[PDB]
């Protein structure tokens, strides 16, 4: 069931909806243009050709669910064409709203924590902000001129957010990025 699988990788990977159209009479050529990328699969039957083209489109789009479970918790993504049926993807311009496009509840905790100044606000203010947003920090050192060693913090999201700063202020920049984006 290639049509179903392609429709899925499209809806799941946050790619746009695939549109399959066969036009030649004779024995059938399917032109599918998921996202201005058009590949042609031609076979004997109307229904049969579509399947071949869908593999062709799938192969190119795939080439480019353990992680997804977490992200599903943080967003209202449908996660299946049918789930979309259950009831126009992200463009390169609108990816800037990742953290910002999140569940009112987790952020509302983070917004309160980052604004609130009631504790040992060192890495306990930053950790709180991210912990509410279900975020794990992959902290790592710089590779040269390590005076007040810089840390490269990578968060576990599709956006691939990596923040670099001085040891003392790495903990302040995390707080700042989060503030601006939410």
């Amino acid at each position: 069931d290639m049509v179903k699988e392609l429709r899925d990788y499209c809806v799941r990977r946050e790619m746009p909806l695939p549109c399959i159209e066969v036009v030649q009479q004779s024995e059938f050529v399917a032109c599918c243009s998921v996202a201005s990328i058009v590949r042609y699969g031609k076979s004997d039957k109307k229904k049969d050709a579509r399947q071949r083209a869908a593999i062709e489109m799938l192969a190119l789009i795939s080439s480019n669910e353990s992680m997804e479970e977490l992200e599903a918790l943080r967003r209202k993504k449908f996660t299946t064409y049918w789930e979309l049926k259950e009831a126009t993807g992200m463009r390169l311009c609108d990816r800037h709203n990742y953290f910002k496009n999140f569940y009112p509840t987790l952020k509302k905790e983070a917004i309160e924590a980052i604004n609130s100044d009631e504790y040992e606000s060192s890495k306990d203010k930053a950790m709180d902000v991210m912990s509410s947003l279900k975020i794990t920090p992959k902290i790592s050192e710089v590779e040269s001129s390590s005076l007040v060693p810089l840390l490269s913090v990578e968060l576990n999201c599709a956006f691939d957010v990596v923040l670099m700063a001085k040891e003392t202020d790495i903990y302040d920049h995390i707080i700042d990025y989060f503030r601006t984006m939410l």
């Binding site: 996202a35 201005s36 670099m164």
Partner: protein
Amino acid sequence: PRGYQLRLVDHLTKSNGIVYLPTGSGKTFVAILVLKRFSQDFDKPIESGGKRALFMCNTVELARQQAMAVRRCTNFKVGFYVGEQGVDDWTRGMWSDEIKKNQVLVGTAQVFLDMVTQTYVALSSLSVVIIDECHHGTGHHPFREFMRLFTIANQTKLPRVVGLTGVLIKGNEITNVATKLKELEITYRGNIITVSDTKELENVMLYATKPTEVMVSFPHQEQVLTVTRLISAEIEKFYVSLDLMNKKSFVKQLFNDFLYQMKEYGIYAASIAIISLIVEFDIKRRQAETLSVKLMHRTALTLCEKIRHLLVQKLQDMNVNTEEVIMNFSTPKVQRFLMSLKVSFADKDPKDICCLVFVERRYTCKCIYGLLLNYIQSTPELRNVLTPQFMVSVLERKWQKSAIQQFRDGNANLMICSSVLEEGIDVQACNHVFILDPVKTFNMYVQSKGRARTTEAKFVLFTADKEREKTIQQIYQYRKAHNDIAEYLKDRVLEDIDPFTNENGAVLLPNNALAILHRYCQTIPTDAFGFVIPWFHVLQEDERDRIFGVSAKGKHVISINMPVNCMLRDTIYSDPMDNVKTAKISAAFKACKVLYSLGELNERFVPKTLKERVASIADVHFEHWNKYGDSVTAKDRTYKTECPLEFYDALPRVGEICYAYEIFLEPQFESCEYTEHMYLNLQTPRNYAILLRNKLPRLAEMPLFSNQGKLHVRVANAPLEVIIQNSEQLELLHQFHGMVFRDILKIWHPFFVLDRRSKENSYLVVPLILQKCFDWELMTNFRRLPQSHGSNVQQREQQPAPRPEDFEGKIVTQWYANYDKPMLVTKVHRELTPLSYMEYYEFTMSKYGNRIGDVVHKDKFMIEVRDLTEQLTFYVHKVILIPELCFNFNFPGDLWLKLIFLPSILNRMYFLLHAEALRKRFNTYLNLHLLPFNGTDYMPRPLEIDYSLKRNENPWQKYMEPVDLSRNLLSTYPVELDYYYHFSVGNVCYWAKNQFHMPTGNIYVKPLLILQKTVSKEHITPAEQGEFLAAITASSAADVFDMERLEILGDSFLKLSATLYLASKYSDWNEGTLTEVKSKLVSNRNLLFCLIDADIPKTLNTIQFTPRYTWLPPGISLPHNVLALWRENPEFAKIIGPHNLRDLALGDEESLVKGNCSDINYNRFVEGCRANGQSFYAGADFSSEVNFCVGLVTIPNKVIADTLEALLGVIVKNYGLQHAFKMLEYFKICRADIDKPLTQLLNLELGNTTEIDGFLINHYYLEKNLGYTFKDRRYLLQALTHPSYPTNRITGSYQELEFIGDAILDFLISAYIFENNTKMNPGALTDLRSALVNNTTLACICVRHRLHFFILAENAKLSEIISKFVNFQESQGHRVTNYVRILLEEADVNVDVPKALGDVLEALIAAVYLDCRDLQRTWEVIFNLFEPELQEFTRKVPINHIRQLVEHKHAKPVFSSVSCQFTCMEKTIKVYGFGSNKDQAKLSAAKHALQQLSKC
């Protein structure tokens, strides 16, 4: 008028030069032509008169561009000495060796400053120094230091300096233009030379009308916004962190550019710049290997996204593509521009308005395109009137090419263009030229103001209030500069005789003499690229003195050099005259006078048309056309038929000798159950014989066929000689003949009567029994086969008991429920009896309820019968029963079987006897009638069957191209950004080697036998009888052979011989006159008339063999009275038809003893003929049906010409070319001169060393690649000289040799294909031949063998069209791909395949032959050149394009009778097909459609 390029090249050849060409990118063609006009000494060594050239450039990268360009466009060896190659520290030894190998030394000015300054290469050694970007050479510069080297060296031995520049003065130095330009002239030792401002080249510096002008103001932002500072600070924090690293500079540059775009073009436009930066950084992050480098590109992206989030949030305060969001958040500059665009472009005529906006950088263009599209779309006032586009990695180039064309075509109205530092904007004249970013260079000002070309057009320039005064000052300085450069350049720009009356009294005037010369130049054969015109040249003082005395000392003389295609080749020197005008007028008069005298102009002084030239030679060569009533100077036919000479008057008499040639049928199959009845019976010694008064030659052994198997027929060479001793024995013979065709095999029609007059086909067939003798008892008893009467039961009682011997081999028919079906008694089943049950008395009785009575005999033998076939045509590949009931003709089984095969042996023999007659005649004429294998000792070989006969540029396509991420920034889905990466990396889809190097790899001699038979008479083989029979057998006859394969060799040879004959006889003609007279000397009509005059069309095998409805049997004819009437009255003949003839119903005496029809029957017949016309089916052409009766055939005008060609083919194959040439004067195609024999056409004359060698610079490499070394290199020179070559006055064009060459190639290729491809049908051989001698298959080989580097031409078009083709082919692999075949050619009226490339290959083939004069050595070259393409095309033959269109599975050809309709991805698309002739037009339309189908 000659193009600026050619005139510039002439001026540069005459004197030093600085070519200032602002636009058109034609600097390269001029650089290449000058380099070629000074290349007569690039071969000689420096030790004795050698000379080399230099191409000094400012930059190494520019030098690479110019070295590659020289190698591609020239046959000159090119060295590339650039300082980075450790070219420094070179000993005199090395600079000596490198000037020995290379000729055009291309490099950087520093390398050659050192070379010339040190005594390494003297300026005397140089013929031409070309300096690129000559503006740079001012004050202290390697260019200026080089020219001072010139000012110290010995004079009278200094090179020709040709500087090239597009920007006359360096940027912003505008103070004293005049002084700077004078200094530049003094430096390069020669005046600047530029073209005027006309249609062909738009000059920027010399345009007069100036556009209306506007300067617009905008104030400083009242408050800097907060997000501008914050975004600025965050990029500072990033700069500190990334500074601590390990590439880094590029990441920094992009962020600094963004900052520029943000401050100068506004907050909103930054929202479109950050999307651009994200794309770039992502592409790069993927293009990495070290994880740490990738880390820099990842952290940058995270900042970019924070930026888009921030910059967007500010706008969000008010999709944010609304007019009121672009307006409120934009630097006052952009607010002014957006309003100014809106108010001005309120004419609202999309087609009328055209606006060019110039911006500072590349990224700016990207961002402003974005801002403009989103403002326009959201603004009701501008939307639908304004469409934007931006003009500024291999894929990147193609996208811009589409954008520039979109603006030029007129789809897009606005073009945002980046800075043009040293180049001219290449767009049409705009209307409102806006400059958003301030002008920084004079070149920017002149190039920009240049685009506004009408007074109506406006030039608007945006400057801030504070800088307004300073800009008003610089614009006045840039306007004064323009007006000064303009005057200096204005000076330096590229700008009564009595009549003669002919004998007739027409008057040539010296005014029209140029017009008449131009018409004569339009007549001579020219390429699609354009006509060639005469070349005028004023003579300098030294020449005037040498040619003429004090007569032209103070006077001017101009010479006119006619094109080589014109007959006149000698230069005509004009009258010594007072003015330049009386020089040109006189030169023209003198040329027209000489052309008239050479018979190239009518008595009315107007060049002769092709028709008039043909009319003069029409009587000389086409005289025979007159009798038939059709003349050369502006279907089918009915011919009689003649039996062979041996069959005419062959009726045996009753007092003379009679020859019986017994016919021996020999089965060639295996005995089985199926064929046992066939083998034994056919081999029985009871054969029939052909009895005739005349003797017969030795006839070949023909293959007949049958259901069982093939069998061989052999008429015996020796005749048993017998004399008839009676007149009743003759009647026995005649009656037995009548009864075979009347009864044994029914071929009888009511009209048929025995033909007792000898007349035609009068031979007899007689039974023969064991030596041998005529069977006289069989003849008596079977005068008429008895009727199957059958009988009654009581009658059946008295019948004697059947005896075994009685029915051993005889023939029987079943009386129960059947009519006249004869069957052969294979064996008597004596052992079994009627009572026995079958694996039976009842079986038969039940089967015929009343038809059979009770059997009289309970016990008897039962006969086994195998029925006999009903078909009388044989050329193309256990019913045990009761005896009492079957009727027993006593006829032998032995003969009945053989006589079924008789009608098809008799027909084949008629035609084989015609074949022997032709053999003898031709052999006698060629005087080979005495050779021992052609004499009385000739023993012919069997007919053999032809088993072959059926009877027996980028790799990616359109849809795979990624979207431009740049032109669609705000709506590119993240998926594409990944596709772009892989596709670009290709995951989804030199100075030591000479240009003329043939790559050693596989793309994709054994002597011709005809050329061995031509040289040695030992190899000659006998012209066989089967070959002449195949050569007269048309394909419609449905036989085992045909004239089609021999016709290919015959047509090839007839075209070669006509070419050689016309080229030798008339050697002062053009290809145009020679190719027309040839195409009319080998035309179907000429050949048809020739064959009709030779009487060959009557003796032809063209009509199928339906032995019953379309055949009169030998010795059996129509009633003599009726046959006389048909011939006597042409009027009745028309009405005499099938229905009338069948009603005659002759019987007994009328159809046997008495020949003539009875008077009553005659009356019945004539009344019948009148009735049809007066009643119904009147005026019907019953000619097909009743032609067979009177002996007439209808043959098309095609088969007759094909037969002539096939006879020529037989002669060529068996006797070589010289004996075949004699045949062409036999048919009176080629009239033969007394002075020059026809046979010696091959060796007939088909037609200073140092001068010839000058044109052929690296001919060693041409000869090495061609495989033939030229002794007389005058043939090489003429093979290479395009008609557009002014310097080659020694020889003529390539056009004379191509004529001779296309014939030598066609003939040799065809002989090879015939001899080696004998398993391919004649249709496939015609296709393989037409696809091996195409003009696109020859152009591919010419490029493959690198022979196009030596073509001598100076045409702009031809050179571009040759380069596009060679670059196409270099990628294709140098193979004849489908795409090359679909490319448009010159013949199909935009040309992709230049014709010149292919004619030059044919001419080189001709030149090879004229030097060697050996068709064997001409073949060794042709084979080596065509060996790769012969192998591939034989494996898969290239189909006619018609076939590709018709056989397009998805597409449906719809030709109009030639517009063609087709289906591409099922979209209705029709492309018009054009062509002068419908047959050629059909192909042409297909090709166009096929390209269109690929276009999809």
